[PDB]
Design a protein around this ligand. Sequence first.
Ligand code: NAG
Ligand code: NAG
Ligand code: CL
Ligand code: CL
Ligand code: MG
Lengths: 244, 13, 190, 178, 200
Amino acid sequence: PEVTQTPSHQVTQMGQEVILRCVPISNHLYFYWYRQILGQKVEFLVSFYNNEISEKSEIFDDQFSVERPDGSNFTLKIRSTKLEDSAMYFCASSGLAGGMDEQFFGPGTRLTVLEDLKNVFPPEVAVFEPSEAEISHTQKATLVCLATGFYPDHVELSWWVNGKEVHSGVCTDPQPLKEQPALNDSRYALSSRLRVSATFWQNPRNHFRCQVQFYGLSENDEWTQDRAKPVTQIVSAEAWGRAD
Amino acid sequence: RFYKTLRAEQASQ
Amino acid sequence: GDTRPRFLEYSTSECHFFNGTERVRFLDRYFYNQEEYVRFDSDVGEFRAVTELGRPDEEYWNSQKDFLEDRRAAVDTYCRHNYGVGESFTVQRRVHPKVTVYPSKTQPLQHHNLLVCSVSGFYPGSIEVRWFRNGQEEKTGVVSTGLIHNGDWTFQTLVMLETVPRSGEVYTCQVEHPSVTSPLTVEWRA
Amino acid sequence: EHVIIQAEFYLNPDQSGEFMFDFDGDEIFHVDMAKKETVWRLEEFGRFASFEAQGALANIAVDKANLEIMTKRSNYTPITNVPPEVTVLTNSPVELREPNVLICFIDKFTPPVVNVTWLRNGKPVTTGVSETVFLPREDHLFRKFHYLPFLPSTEDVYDCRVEHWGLDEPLLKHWEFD
Amino acid sequence: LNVEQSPQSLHVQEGDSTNFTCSFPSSNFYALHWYRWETAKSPEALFVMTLNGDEKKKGRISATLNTKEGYSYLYIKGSQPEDSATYLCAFKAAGNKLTFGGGTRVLVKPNIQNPDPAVYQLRDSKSSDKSVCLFTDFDSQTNVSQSKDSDVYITDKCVLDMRSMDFKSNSAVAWSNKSDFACANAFNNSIIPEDTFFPS
Ligand SMILES: *[C@@H]1O[C@H](CO)[C@@H](O)[C@H](O)[C@H]1NC(C)=O
Ligand SMILES: *[C@@H]1O[C@H](CO)[C@@H](O)[C@H](O)[C@H]1NC(C)=O
Ligand SMILES: [Cl-]
Ligand SMILES: [Cl-]
Ligand SMILES: [Mg+2]
């Protein structure tokens, strides 16, 4: 019983039209859109009920639009993106037409609005094998994954052991760091660690993989540079078990 | 102060 | 005029106040084409179908605990709240009645005529109008139109008296109203 | 003893809706469905109190949805028209030359749709004209008031022409000085 | 119109209690909502408060409402690591739109048992590209200060839990593309305890 939002993240050029799609809870009566600019408060945009706009933000209408095409989907359309449209877009729904209940929020779409797509770069992903010293001292093995040089911010790092995603023994930086912190178009770096028992790491029939999902250029975006189009992609690095 | 509306609910379908 | 069928959805949310706000009875009523089909009475505590038309709503609305709870709390959050919001210009609204005394017709002395007492532009509705022949109250021959609502926070009344007047006669009209400390008296003589 | 009523309706196919607050038979305010603003009965009430028009607009939306559901539920049973009683009266006792107001009180009718026009010597008047919205009643029928500020004269006759679907032809209520 | 939350950020040691406040208009009140918002998750409702003086409990989380004064208090008793989230409060007037506060970002500092602070050097990815230093197994009191040098990169502390093992640990990472960079000098700006193990 949840609200779903696609895509997770989106990169768009300034001035272009964007469509944030959403799937409210099936039997819900009221549908909403909220947005949050980084470091700012979650702000209301629009509410919708029985095929009509109920309340709208003082900004909305002059810029945005909503549509309810079928009894399953709800969408938000930004006519012409601006640098100030860079926010996390939340979709919500509530069951009662009276409003005396909670609003269920979607996971949100991270929209990044850029002046130019030229500075978009996918990450480089590398895995650093555990220190033999660490093994000899703690009988534990820490693998380190680094995702570097990506632009813009927000990638999803995951660890896979023998084809299965692992969450135990894992920790990833909640926020990435800037490579050239002076620059405003500065690329990012993100790290993560996976810790296992020395026995587990020493078994050579154990495969370790680090995956980074990057959200970049779209199917219909323009690309004129010599380097590979920085499209949405999964970049990965791997490590095998060493008996040592 | 504010006059409060008693909010209405959608009927059974 | 236009003969197309009409469909009317009407709802009332009633707040009945007894002894200030000491006792409050709350009612949320639903009508379809003049027919009340479902209601919530604070003295019942839940939605109850009035007709067969209300049945689905009765079971559906009582199954919605957030909505049902809003109704169980209405006596305070809604009724008493709203009572306090306007109390000073509503329960405390006091408008002075304007009093005029005149004969209806230009009929000569020793013959019948109707003595009119016009009480107008007053608030609230509760008013006592009394007719006096020569200091003594006349209970008979008093024709009232009753309380007339002007639909603008003012009332009016025409209290007429059947009169066969004499040369010495002094007719006096008394108006008792919440907005007046000293009861108003207007006199007419032949 | 006091009664506070929140009265709301929605009518099809007219697509006409109404939201009002009533205190002891008098209107406190209503929400204008065109302007989407709160219209206070006496200007002073807007100085002593507040209202968020949105609560009323949200309730009208629901009444509109509930009308669609109740129509289907009743197997499209239409409303029976109850024609109105019309009374013409004055604000205060009439006196030639001193300004007064003609009150036209339309009562005990349903649906709450009425075409009301003021006639002076058979011709229509709109000067200084005001009206109320549809007011509630314990019997669930409606009330309405129309106002005409006028200068009492012996040379003038007034009429209030009322049109309701429950009336065979338009009802006229006469007034003249006497 | 306006909702304010205090404080903006908050640190609390595992097991300890904390609380934070929400201020909303004292006029046209219908509801006050509290939402829990974890990092990559969606904001999930904790409470919908409508009655003045009501106290609601959802396990170790409590909420109080004072409508006359225009304030709400959120209480977290015996704070757990899973309680780390941004707590948002939203005010509801006559319509359905929510007016949000700025939130209270809660960081529950975990209890670290068996602290063996150490700085290791992992074997570089084929080969070499960069050198990576790992500062692990330190106590929650040890603060990881920034790089200081523009050529070196240092990430803030991070807690990893081996659920099966019931073991929790801190870690920070240091890296640089050549040449003088080494383990001992890696975490200079940070307060390194004297007990910190260095393998030679
Ligand atoms: C409902 O409406 C239709 C058409 O006028 C009719 O066939 C039917 O008899 C009505 N009654 C019921 C109970 O459906
Ligand atoms: C009122 O006036 C309009 C236009 O003449 C008309 O369509 C409507 O039916 C009339 N309403 C009545 C007679 O109730
Ligand atoms: Cl207002
Ligand atoms: Cl709750
Ligand atoms: Mg208020």
